[model samples]
Target chain A: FDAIPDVIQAFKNGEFVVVLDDPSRENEADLIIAAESVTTEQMAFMVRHSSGLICAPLTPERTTALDLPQMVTHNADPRGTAYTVSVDAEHPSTTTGISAHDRALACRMLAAPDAQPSHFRRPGHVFPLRAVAGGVRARRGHTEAGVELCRLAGKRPVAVISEIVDDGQEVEGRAVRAAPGMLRGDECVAFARRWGLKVCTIEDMIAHVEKTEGKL
Target chain B: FDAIPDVIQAFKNGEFVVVLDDPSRENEADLIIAAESVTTEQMAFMVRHSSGLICAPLTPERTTALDLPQMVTHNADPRGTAYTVSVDAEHPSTTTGISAHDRALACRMLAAPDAQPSHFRRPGHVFPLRAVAGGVRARRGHTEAGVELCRLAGKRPVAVISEIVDDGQEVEGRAVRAAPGMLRGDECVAFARRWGLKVCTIEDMIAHVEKTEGKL
Candidate 1:
């Protein structure tokens, strides 16, 4: 209700929205940002705070046109996430693509449907995920939730998503070492509140989308 | 009782323990580390996570020995924290004292009772705070609580203390900008859990000390 407008605005502004899914499902919260407009600063922030695997969700048509193959012939992922081959922008501005600047440019390039296969270099820094035919109303994973959020915001149906992970900071203060872990639904809410970011739950997202047109 | 031992053990390991004071008072949590054994890595961590204003809590005897004057001729800080003149190590090994390495060295030097006035240069990077005559039992400030924590751990009664402040990230999304702030007792506990650091409070500290001996 109230959060949909804010989530849309945050999505449009290229800022982050902490998105959470049900505990019965993937049960994780992702730091979600618009793929079309991420800046190096935002990318750097995601790289540092997140698990460092930068993933983008795009339409199936985009993947099929680009001739990108899914990462695995036999998928073992329980969530059925459609992860395509990793890529890097084949543009002159793209160097290693490992740098925040290169990744930001790559994500922006990935968002445009008219982008050609020649515009990318396979086995590079950016990772492209294929979204389901229908967005969040059909699929409950972050993959669909992200692209759907973009669509609802009236932007391109592409989104940059990453899991916010703990610093994985382990020291020898205790007898055992500390282990790094992912932020579940509960911790994610706390993390966003501490960082002063807005939060939206998948529950609210689905209800809002169901009330109106699900996806553009 | 449970946290006191862990806090002591953590202090002995030269690690951080988030310390909280009463809410009616300063009501803030501080990142407390033992000054005698801080390494450059630890100093760097403190510099990054904390407000960057690193102050070492030393005994009143040490302050008088160093001939360091209190920062204020007339005390005005409501907390009544006895902040002395800032200083840096006057040694060949010291560069610009602002560097974490130099600050670590200065703090270690400041911890030594044998350290002479000639061992330091006035008006430098490390700010020394004079602990109260009786530490936390007499006063309720982080300065007193820090030194008290160190004393409880059977280490030198000197501690490096800094306030953990928010990133104060203001962006162009909302009509207003977000302002930076300090972590209260509540947020401090949450902050420690996020970073996997142990947390202790003035309440437990006072209880533990009163049950045993007050201060060394």
Candidate 2:
């Protein structure tokens, strides 16, 4: 158990010789654990390994157990939410409702959420909001869309669609117009193509959450 | 419960119509619990109108409750920690650690081991850490040193020193150093300082984190 540090150090060193090979399974190279007494460091090591990482769950021996450790190996970057943008719009994007071409055209970036949001509720799926010169932020959900839009032009999204226009009158009352601050010039068009957001300003961005009664 | 928002808004609107006018007595404004309450919102409005800002130990209606609501009535500017260059050796400098400065500094920042270390936790004394421009940062027991430095320099600190530093060592271990490919000189320095790291090169910085296992 204490040798867990050695396991972590090996993963850091890129020395995954025995850990990768599953002798019981013919060609399986990844080690998946359901339940076994191990150190926190060992599970952390499995996270750093380059091979396809799929684990059952890792509960830290601390005050409270955390959600299972998740690793999106190889297919995604190890940073925040990983986004990819492409000009090609290919089909057959099943299960994840995500496509390579759509991802490629969207500009890949990391999507992570804030530590806290008003109260203690956790966001369902963290979506990439916008990327600045150095860092990118991940928003919780769309301001109006039923589905979470991954990225805008490659920027991890900042403004999430919290509330929609419930008035049903002018363009301003439309759900799409609710969050005009997030809508850039062409982004309004791009976002409109997939999700109908008319205006995306900072104010709508702020009000979206409260209008939703803290659902996001 | 929902009355808290109305209270906050009322306080912001400056609608103060009640006061006991007692100097030494605890007559700021007290909450009167009714057998069958009229409205939690009214109580929240009372707290808000009376205190301006309230915090608590919280309730379904309060979103926060139990403790006295802290009323905030200041037109405070939201600010990052201030950066000030100082060479004041006479004020029991943290750099020099002479006189009663170190002890005084420590007393201000460190958690009482037995006591919670927030104002909101302890009532009377104040402690803060000093600011360092380059690689050096304030120690754990000297958080007030950093804050004091900031306070003296007229800067508002958001993060505490204990959160930023480790065992009198540079916090982010040398991320301050490893900036060639990633960050430029000034950018690197600023980044390291923001994260409380000190080092000269990105390689050294990476090595520092990598070698330390993941304590950083």
Candidate 3:
């Protein structure tokens, strides 16, 4: 709760926030950024450091309208994370659909109030997760925490996030390091410190949201 | 078409069949095994040589009735494979749900004639893919091909499959080799030859189905 104002400030300043969910849960710390402010370069940085899943959290309304359906018939993700079908922007400028630049473009467009189902093509590189109906209070996973943090920041409540992983393996000459799993505890703090990014937890977000929005 | 008899015989005999899709498609061969005959050893064999994303292909009716909805709404997989939410058997014997034994049990249970939605738990390790409505004729991917092979074999048409990959790496002294892409033509044939497994192509499967069932 103490970090709310500063956290929101940095997020408003177009910076990434490290949202750490409960360790007993997915035990993941995601690098979160506002969908509206994302850029190709920022997306690239995320891809380089994070797990590269690059999940975009959107409101249920937006998801339902945008033709984004739930990824599973039965919510099987251990934490009940509601991942919707992935998408790539159908916009003319998009190419290959896997590039960081095009992904950024898709993120920015997906956050628009006038976004439509036809605006983005489905089964794309950018995986979209449907936020819980009641936000962080309902679900303590990184997905809800991200969207709630955006709402607290007075943004449209759509955010982009990717779980921070411990990089390993150097494939080819350029070294494509694929991290085995998400980083945890002190490792996450060290990562946030190294990147100079604001770090918050799901508990803090829930407390702050309840204080401001009057208890779920 | 020539390989159909031997392929179906091997499959009917409870041996794995390597079903290779087109090079232009997902461009990989999958270790195809029937759900009715899956054993822990067979599951382990798949987990070892293949990509380990064990997929079960079931008819549209079974998928719809068993709460196994499509994994995505718009279907972005370049090959348009309809993946449903994964599942594990709800039976008492299934332990941990991920082990080869438990997964084998779940696979066999899912193929039972009286299988019901409540018989399985959602978000499990065994990924169930919805076979195209028109079988292999409608979709020329491994998912459809596996199911069609079962139908042609006079089986109930529920089959398990995993893409064969070129292994690399050794982790924890176990040499956990994670291949970058699915094995290609010669690589697939070599993999099948090494294991004495029957090999067939999507075109061959499609032609056989047409011959047996009279056109798509």
Candidate 4:
């Protein structure tokens, strides 16, 4: 509770903005948003209360601390940003040097593709993203989602180049699920379909940026 | 030809072993080695040579007969079985199943643990495998192969996963790189990490299986 004023003042001072935790109400801040001890099922339940958005930082420990299968049952907000950009980091949450601010920026950038590419690396060296290339794959139960992602990317049939986890909702025509951490492309497709509200691979979206900038 | 008796005879009469093809020899023998024609930059020059070995009674081809990457790279000879089990039905290639004899028996059973489960039912099932649990993410980029795999497998502290590619001249450290196919556990980890092998996410793998398996 002591951190609320500082955190809130930081947001108003243009230093930082906390997306999920609304510290305005102090003890009455609707929901107690803490990633520390919440289960995925609890997270899911809290997110549904309409009390507030719950944006907890992901850690290897926090992910394993909960029942993720339960958290994944609901439909993702269709209005969640636009297409997610491409990144080389094996896991989106684990990308090095990326900060919460970067995630906020990503959320904005995905929604507004026309924004100048300033702030990514260099100022004047910006370009639009292009379509996702290469193929996606699955083993466990992710194969169908892989095929769908490629199809959504508007490409001819292709197979997964490697083993991939089918992020659950991807099969249900939503975005992403759990392989318990396999980083499967089915999750990629599911997130694209639901979280970002667009059906495209990260590769496809990156390629789209390239096309917009006339790079490829 | 004298080595034929030595290699095949080394195993029990019905058992088989995979022997890397001698790239220098192009003679028409009982059958061409599995994964005979896939892309890799390892060789010093672009010449046709034996890269890996396989057992007989090969799995047939997809439309073009160009074996897919998963079949080519994911199949193995882990237990000296003659068969090459395929996660993808369309890309089945007997020469690549993990073991030579395992390839021969795929006709009677699907991949081990998943043989009886439907590729389409809910999460679906793939066989001939065990489970890898949920601890692979911690060692994502550790360079020491032995340490990473040991951490993933919860095995001995110094157990290392090694791959001696390029006729054993290019031996290197590796973590478990499982296929995302029917087999589960470490086998799935082994397959997923074959190319630029890395720590995988399990959530995504399950999604991959759920979506793609039924087509087989």
Candidate 5:
């Protein structure tokens, strides 16, 4: 039904997958990809479909390595909105958070590899991570599924949260943002349940890649 | 020494003309055109070139004819936070005052008249007009030059203002909102001065069309 099989299979194969209508945001969703295995096509898909910011989780070590910007986590934990920053950055990178526009630019760069970097001047969001009692803990933005997955798998999570508009309707004569072959968040979750896909998180993905390592 | 001549000449010939980077806004400008002479290409140009909202000067009669929504002009004139509205519609227009996104949609509809009208839900801005002491007084918006022209030429003004980004330079691997053969606002103004062009406004355009009404 409705390409659920293709999506689940694609996820099992370690390809990029999108979940729509994230329960938390209702109108938004997450585009999940394993940082270690991202491709130009996957980047393009995220850029084309997202209507909001794209964020990622990073370990403190990698954060320092990339010179990513950080802020005090707000709202959920480690309260004090006045003192904390919501995982954010000032540049675009797989290891950083960025706006949908910048993400589109980054994707274009990925596709061309020769594009100028100066055009994108805004910083992206990079949630800092640390080892908690059970797993890794990072700041949450619009999408929490990917980061939660990392905690479950006991691995560092690199998440990208984007504004998703899955509605394929066009306004005027121009096309609004829409991704092809993408399922709604709820739809994806429903399919996941039917296919016995646990968590719908990247931890499951990383584990799948390891178990099937070198097989596919 | 720029292509200012080309732009002014185009307007004189009843072609849609674009100007970028009004010194005041730095990042914005207008795509000025007469309501009576709009073409599919002109509409397309505005949609493709603008980086902000697109506006137009319209009489109340024209606004009603198009069945557009009107709103009280707020924050610019008529004073608080220093003053009143800038040509806002009671509703909104898919025709006159449209955002770049909606304008693109409207242009598409214009390009393909058979498309469903349900796709466009908002009303566009079109200025209301009346005879003032010196010239025509219409609703004020971001740009005021177009309405001024109508008074000077003793004609009604139907000016369209669009958010324009005329970088004249394309970034590597990025599609900036650049229009072909477009000039920066200052460049256009400079060229106008050189060519003895008066009031880079729609009034001049309407007058030109009337004088040469017999020809294309």
Candidate 6:
């Protein structure tokens, strides 16, 4: 595995980093962005690109405090499924399990004191928000592993799996669920270009992981 | 002012209530949904129909707990914004701020436990989201007044301003901020019909206000 200095730097700077996971599994990549650092434009890109549900990491205290719901993980162990939350207030952190638009709105809400409370109180409200909590998973081009990699590198795991869309068409459709089918390297590469988000490969992460985990 | 029994019932049941403000001040309507009781479909409708920033209501205690930003109000005394809170592990109530997508995701996250903590911990993290917190302002096609109405009617305030689009055309364009331009009553009427959201005139709200304030 080769080290990705660029990705490392990007993560350190709290920038958006798109991680292309193992080629063998699929062309799935994790679209990683610093939750606290994401911008409205970048968030718009994430919402427009991601094929899988966007998720995030949280501490037990925060999770418990929020009474967030849980999801069952592949590596199940009492750790439930990904729960969701919203950035109803401008916190210093990012949430998981939502789209970029939500993040952008959360960012704006961070600065808005006059914002309404009912907006954030709704069960399935919009604007700024978060999704799952706990940690992430690995495999099948999922960014769970990539998020872990970010963590290993001493960074927050701000990542989501980016699904490559064929035919250069939008993956999100009105009233129509999208498919997490496959990704072509060039297509994914082009996709990153279109959104102006940074791109990396799991291979780079692998090296960073090995180094961070003492394998190096 | 005559009491709207149907609106009252819906508020008790925690359903969405779209209030059309005074016809004199733009065809602005407040899109209301209980923070603790909105449906995903309804949320989607808000995202699609609203031209203004979606807002929620919140209480003072919850606001401080979430470290939410506060906005000044004209009511000068109690009539605050209708904010929502999350049933997360940490708090007893939810926060305000954020967007419709965040709210929808938060609704889903509420049921998920296997969620990743890293997902929510990142800066601007998602999942177990709170949407936006604090409160909102009154007037000009906003939800503050609607939320006030809800509270006056002994209900929760969960609302946003619905922008009446001209010619039924979408207001958002790529890199182009949509105009908060003049609204045609018929166009707004048609827009509300497309989403099936209930509509009430601000005049109705004004009457409700007088009636409720008289009680207070």
Model 5, runs deviating above 4 Å: A1-14, A20-28, A60-67, A71-144, A148-156, A171-216, B1-216
Identify the superior model by lDDT, candidate 2 or candidate 4: 4
Candidate ranking (DockQ, best to worst):
3, 6, 5, 4, 1, 2
Of candidate 1 chain A, the 10-residue stretch with the lowest lDDT total is A172-181
Q: Write the per-residue lDDT of candidate 3 for residues B32-138, one digit (tens) a residue.
A: 98898787666656654554456789988888778787666657555666777667788877643555566778888888888889888776657788887888888
Pick the TM-score winner. Answer: 3
In the order shown, the candidates' DockQ scores are: 0.01, 0.01, 0.10, 0.02, 0.03, 0.04
RMSD of each: 20.2, 26.5, 8.0, 22.6, 15.2, 11.9
Interface RMSD of each: 20.1, 26.3, 11.4, 23.2, 14.9, 11.9
Every model's TM-score: 0.49, 0.18, 0.58, 0.19, 0.33, 0.40
Q: Which ranges in model 2 have alpha carbons more than 4 Å from their true place?
A: A1-140, A143-181, A184-187, A190-216, B1-149, B156-181, B184-216
Candidate 4 lDDT score at position B97: 23
lDDT of 1 by residue, A19-135 (tens): 988877656678888888887667766655564457888889778887677755544343566777666777887643455666778899888768777777665556678889877
Write model 5 residue lDDT over A1-216, tens digit each, in one string: 224334445544444455443234233335554443444334434444332223454333444444333232211121111111122222334321222233433433322223222322222222223222222122223233444443334433444444343333333433122222224556655533543332243333333444535322
Query: For candidate 1, lDDT tens digit of each residue in B28-145?
Result: 6788988887876676567555655578998898888887777555443335567675677888877435556677799999887688887877655577888888767788778888
Q: Find the candidate with the highest lDDT and give its number.
A: 3
Per-residue lDDT of candidate 2, residues B18-115 (tens digit): 11112232112212111111122332222211111111111111112212122122211121122111011112233211112222232322322222
Which regions of candidate 1 deviate over 4 angstroms? Answer: A1-216, B168-179, B213-216
Ranking by lDDT: 3, 1, 6, 5, 4, 2
Q: Clash pairs of candidate 1?
A: A168-A180
Q: After superposition, how far is residue A202 of candidate 3 from its true place, in Å?
A: 2.7
Tens-digit lDDT track for model 6 on A1-216? 114676666666755566676666544555665444555455444444342233444334333444433322122211222434333333334221122344455544432334343323222223222223322332223334444545555654333333332212222322212222334566666655654446767666555555645443
